[PDB]
Amino acid sequence: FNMKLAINAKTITSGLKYALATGNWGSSRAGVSQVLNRYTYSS
Amino acid sequence: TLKYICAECSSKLSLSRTDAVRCKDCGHRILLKARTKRLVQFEAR
Amino acid sequence: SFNQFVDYTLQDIICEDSTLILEQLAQISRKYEISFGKIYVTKPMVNESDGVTHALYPQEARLRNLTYSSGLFVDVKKRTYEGKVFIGRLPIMLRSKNCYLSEATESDLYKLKECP
Amino acid sequence: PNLNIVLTCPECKVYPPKIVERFSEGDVVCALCGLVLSDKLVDTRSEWRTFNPLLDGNNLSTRIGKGETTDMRFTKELNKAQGKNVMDKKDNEVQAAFAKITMLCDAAELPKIVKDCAKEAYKLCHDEKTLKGKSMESIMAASILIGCRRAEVARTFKEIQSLIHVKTKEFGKTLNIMKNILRGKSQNLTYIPRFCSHLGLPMQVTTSAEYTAKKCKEIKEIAGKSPITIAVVSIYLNILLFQIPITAAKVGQTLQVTEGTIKSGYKILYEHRDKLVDP
Amino acid sequence: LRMKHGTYDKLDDDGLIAPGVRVSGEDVIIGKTTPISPDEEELGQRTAYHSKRDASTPLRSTENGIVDQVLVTTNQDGLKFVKVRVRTTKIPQIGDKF
Amino acid sequence: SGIVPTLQNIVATVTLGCRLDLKTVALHARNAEYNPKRFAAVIMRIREPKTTALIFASGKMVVTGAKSEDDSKLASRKYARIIQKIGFAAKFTDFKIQNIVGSCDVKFPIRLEGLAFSHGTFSSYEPELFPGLIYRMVKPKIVLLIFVSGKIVLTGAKQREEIYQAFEAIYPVLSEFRKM
Amino acid sequence: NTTVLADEFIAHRLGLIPLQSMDIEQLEYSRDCFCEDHCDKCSVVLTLQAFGESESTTNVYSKDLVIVSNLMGRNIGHPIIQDKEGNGVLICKLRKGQELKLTCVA
Amino acid sequence: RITTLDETVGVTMSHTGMSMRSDNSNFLKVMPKKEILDYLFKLFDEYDYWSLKGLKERTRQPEAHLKECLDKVATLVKKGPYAFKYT
Numbered sequence: 032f033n034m035k036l037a038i039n040a041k042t043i044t045s046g047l048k049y050a051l052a053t054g055n056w057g058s059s060r061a062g063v064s065q066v067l068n069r070y071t072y073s074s
Numbered sequence: 075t076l077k078y079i080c081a082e083c084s085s086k087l088s089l090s091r092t093d094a095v096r097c098k099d100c101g102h103r104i105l106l107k108a109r110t111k112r113l114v115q116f117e118a119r
Numbered sequence: 120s121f122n123q124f125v126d127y128t129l130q131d132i133i134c135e136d137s138t139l140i141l142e143q144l145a146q147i148s149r150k151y152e153i154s155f156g157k158i159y160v161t162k163p164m165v166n167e168s169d170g171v172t173h174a175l176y177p178q179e180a181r182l183r184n185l186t187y188s189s190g191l192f193v194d195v196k197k198r199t200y201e202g203k204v205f206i207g208r209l210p211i212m213l214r215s216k217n218c219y220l221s222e223a224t225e226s227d228l229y230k231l232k233e234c235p
Numbered sequence: 236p237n238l239n240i241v242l243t244c245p246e247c248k249v250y251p252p253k254i255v256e257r258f259s260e261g262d263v264v265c266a267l268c269g270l271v272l273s274d275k276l277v278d279t280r281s282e283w284r285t286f287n288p289l290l291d292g293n294n295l296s297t298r299i300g301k302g303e304t305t306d307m308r309f310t311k312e313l314n315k316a317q318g319k320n321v322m323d324k325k326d327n328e329v330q331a332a333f334a335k336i337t338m339l340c341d342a343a344e345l346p347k348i349v350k351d352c353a354k355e356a357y358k359l360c361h362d363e364k365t366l367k368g369k370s371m372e373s374i375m376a377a378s379i380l381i382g383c384r385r386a387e388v389a390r391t392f393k394e395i396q397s398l399i400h401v402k403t404k405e406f407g408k409t410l411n412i413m414k415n416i417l418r419g420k421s422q423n424l425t426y427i428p429r430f431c432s433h434l435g436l437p438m439q440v441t442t443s444a445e446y447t448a449k450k451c452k453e454i455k456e457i458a459g460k461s462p463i464t465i466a467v468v469s470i471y472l473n474i475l476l477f478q479i480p481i482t483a484a485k486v487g488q489t490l491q492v493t494e495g496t497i498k499s500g501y502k503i504l505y506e507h508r509d510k511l512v513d514p
Numbered sequence: 515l516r517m518k519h520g521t522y523d524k525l526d527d528d529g530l531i532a533p534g535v536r537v538s539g540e541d542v543i544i545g546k547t548t549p550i551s552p553d554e555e556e557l558g559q560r561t562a563y564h565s566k567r568d569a570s571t572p573l574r575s576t577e578n579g580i581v582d583q584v585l586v587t588t589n590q591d592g593l594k595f596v597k598v599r600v601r602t603t604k605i606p607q608i609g610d611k612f
Numbered sequence: 613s614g615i616v617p618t619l620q621n622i623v624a625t626v627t628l629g630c631r632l633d634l635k636t637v638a639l640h641a642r643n644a645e646y647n648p649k650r651f652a653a654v655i656m657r658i659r660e661p662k663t664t665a666l667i668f669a670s671g672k673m674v675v676t677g678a679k680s681e682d683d684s685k686l687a688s689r690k691y692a693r694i695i696q697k698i699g700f701a702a703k704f705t706d707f708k709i710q711n712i713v714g715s716c717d718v719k720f721p722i723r724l725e726g727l728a729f730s731h732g733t734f735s736s737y738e739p740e741l742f743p744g745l746i747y748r749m750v751k752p753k754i755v756l757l758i759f760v761s762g763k764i765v766l767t768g769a770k771q772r773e774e775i776y777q778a779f780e781a782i783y784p785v786l787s788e789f790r791k792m
Numbered sequence: 793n794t795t796v797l798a799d800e801f802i803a804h805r806l807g808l809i810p811l812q813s814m815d816i817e818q819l820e821y822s823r824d825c826f827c828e829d830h831c832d833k834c835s836v837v838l839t840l841q842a843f844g845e846s847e848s849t850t851n852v853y854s855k856d857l858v859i860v861s862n863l864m865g866r867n868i869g870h871p872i873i874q875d876k877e878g879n880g881v882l883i884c885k886l887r888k889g890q891e892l893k894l895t896c897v898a
Numbered sequence: 899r900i901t902t903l904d905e906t907v908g909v910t911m912s913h914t915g916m917s918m919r920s921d922n923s924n925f926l927k928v929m930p931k932k933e934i935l936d937y938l939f940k941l942f943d944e945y946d947y948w949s950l951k952g953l954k955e956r957t958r959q960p961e962a963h964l965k966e967c968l969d970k971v972a973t974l975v976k977k978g979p980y981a982f983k984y985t
């Protein structure tokens with residue numbers, strides 16, 4: 032047996048990092064996360 | 075080789091091709107590029 | 120909200136299914152089950168391609184196109200029925216309790232090159 | 236047949252010609268007379284702007300599933316008609332290799348370039364008398380070490396052995412052939428820093444060892460029988476040059492090394508302490 | 515093979531301009547080439563080169579102004595990569611929106 | 613060259629021509645190591661000539677540790693005589709040496725890195741388990757193990773003569789690759 | 793120029809710095825000289841060195857322009873100083889370590 | 899709240915990757931034809947429904963003598979109840 036074969040970090044890491052990078056909250060939910068807008072401070 | 079500058083350590087670097095992209099004195103991995111020497115001309119318009 | 124998620128909702132997500140079992144039957148039945156205990160979140164950092172791992176500040180993340188996150192770790196009990204484990208990295212919101220900047224001072228924010 | 240096209244100004248003809256592509260006009264012109272040779276140029280970045288053959292070759296693929304407008308009496312048979320041609324292809328052992336090694340290098344926390352070289356290093360050899368099976372691990376255990384080192388990241392045999400238990404022997408024979416597979420188809424420095432971080436040390440202690448280990452290597456002291464060990468002694472050499480508690484016993488298990496090789500290795504160091512003086 | 519009719523002289527040896535250099539439209543900013551097999555395609559005039567097809571990045575066809583700063587790092591995977599920033603001054607003009 | 617490839621082991625096969633009672637062979641011998649739980653062959657070490665031999669239920673004996681064709685041959689004849697004293701009419705028939713492995717020295721330090729790197733096609737190296745190079749020759753077909761100490765381990769011949777020929781061929785390579 | 797201002801930004805401020813031009817008829821329109829674009833018969837040359845030395849900020853003023861071409865006795869080119877502390881127009885600010893060197897042509 | 903691990907980042911990740919250590923927590927670690935026939939007749943006589951395993955364990959001798967020499971006067975069925983039975 033080994034944990035390292037069982038526990039697969041690349042599950043979580045790649046999960047969150049993907050639902051942030053695209054807006055696809057998964058799908059079924061898109062545009063949840065957008066590139067921050069820095070035209071001017073108040074925007 | 076050409077001059078570079080650490081981003082934080084801020085030391086002139088002068089590495090070459092196939093050297094590590096890495097700063098002495100801090101293994102910081104960001105380098106700027108040591109602005110040109112030839113003069114540059116603007117108009118005060 | 121993010122602060123709340125990191126403090127509580129993370130832990131309670133883990134411990135709602137803290138265990139999972141497995142039993143095999145013999146001629147006496149061997150049974151296995153794995154526990155999930157405390158959870159630990161580091162301060163943000165990156166593991167460089169060489170192998171080295173070090174703190175990651177938000178400037179460096181933006182320049183080098185990294186992801187500003189910190190690792191997750193949980194304790195486990197393995198149970199044979201008749202230490203802390205990496206599980207992945209949590210992207211951090213800036214200025215949140217777990218971010219390097221959360222408590223930094225102005226004169227320090229300039230040092231890190233972050234607009235106050 | 237030769238099926239080949241070449242352009243040349245039929246009114247200069249002087250050369251293998253001097254022509255330029257005016258892209259923004261969709262033209263190619265004789266750079267001498269400016270006769271336009273051929274026009275209606277087709278774009279070259281917009282093409283892939285709207286958007287693995289090195290592995291997946293010519294037998295193509297397409298992920299077939301269930302849409303919104305299908306009931307389970309048609310969906311599951313798409314899962315029951317896709318299963319009739321998985322053995323004419325050895326490609327299960329092709330993809331399930333990649334999927335496995337992808338599952339490996341990724342779980343191993345490795346750069347996604349190594350993943351490719353191993354997705355390569357499998358695919359290039361992928362069947363040989365030397366291979367002839369041999370547990371199908373040792374390659375995915377060596378093609379990674381290949382894919383690792385070939386991607387300029389070197390890891391110890393034990394380190395992969397942690398990932399996959401290869402009996403340490405099925406590894407060795409499989410490696411030799413593999414390396415020679417590419418040679419026919421045709422570096423321990425990497426260990427100093429990955430170790431320092433494993434001990435959580437500032438850069439200078441690691442900074443120095445590159446000088447010391449190279450200098451200890453450069454003159455004499457073959458020293459080591461798998462120089463993995465005599466790497467670490469540089470840290471131990473240099474950590475004692477500093478005064479930071481990494482006591483020998485803590486070193487060992489953290490890096491899974493014999494303690495004996497340290498002190499005896501450090502024998503050649505408590506005596507060679509002469510020439511490592513940079514400051 | 516397959517170079518851009520824009521100039522390359524503004525580059526340095528390492529395929530980068532240096533901060534301070536005034537550039538104009540259709541000037542190669544980042545010089546990159548991807549090696550090709552001598553016999554990979556033989557497209558046109560490969561028989562003299564055998565080496566490499568260029569993949570440099572030219573400045574936009576309508577922009578200009580001075581390179582402001584150039585930084586060089588490695589991505590997560592230790593691959594070199596570079597970010598060039600170009601600075602322009604926009605003076606109000608006739609069709610501009612206020 | 614000027615260096616004789618010094619044999620360290622000769623492994624040879626001897627057909628005694630009888631189905632030997634390996635139990636009685638072990639019983640009537642003076643110091644013989646035979647138990648079925650390791651092999652189906654009585655292993656005898658005779659100090660003169662000091663050779664170690666495994667003799668099977670087929671009566672075939674393979675002999676190792678000899679320092680010559682004649683060390684092994686005389687040892688095998690003594691082995692057959694011992695078997696006949698045991699009670700089986702062993703006979704030296706269709707003998708053949710199946711292996712002649714030797715170690716000698718050329719004594720000049722070698723750029724083993726140069727050979728292995730430039731003869732990657734022929735020789736492979738992973739210096740993190742075993743510091744020796746492996747080299748092949750077809751004429752004569754000798755495989756040679758090389759180490760920085762100058763030791764040459766020549767193997768792959770029924771005779772020391774192929775050892776000699778490939779050594780006369782490979783010593784010039786060694787001197788060519790001599791590190792200094 | 794390692795200040796915190798862009799060049800064309802600074803260059804634009806230099807243009808607006810009002811120079812002494814009482815005796816300006818004794819100059820010529822730079823498209824009437826035959827010089828290789830400029831000479832003392834058609835232009836005045838100044839220069840500006842500044843270096844941030846104190847730990848405090850250090851201000852560059854128009855009074856720090858120094859003429860480095862032969863005026864030929866004509867009375868032109870000096871930066872007008874209307875103020876009472878005798879510093880003219882503030883041009884830039886410098887923190888220690890920051891440098892500005894440039895050459896202007898009026 | 900969470901004990902946000904106060905260590906340096908470098909040390910903690912050391913054990914996550916290839917630490918080359920394991921098993922620190924024990925868990926899922928995982929010949930006479932006369933005598934053979936005399937026992938084979940004994941195997942046949944004592945229990946005609948004599949499976950090979952019940953015979954091989956009772957053989958306690960080389961596998962050759964029990965399986966081969968007994969194959970003549972003992973008939974072994976393959977399927978059904980009295981299968982593999984030296985009856």
Ligand SMILES: [Zn+2]
Nearest residue numbers: 244247265268
């Ligand atoms: Zn023409």
Ligand SMILES: [Zn+2]
Nearest residue numbers: 825827831834
């Ligand atoms: Zn003039």
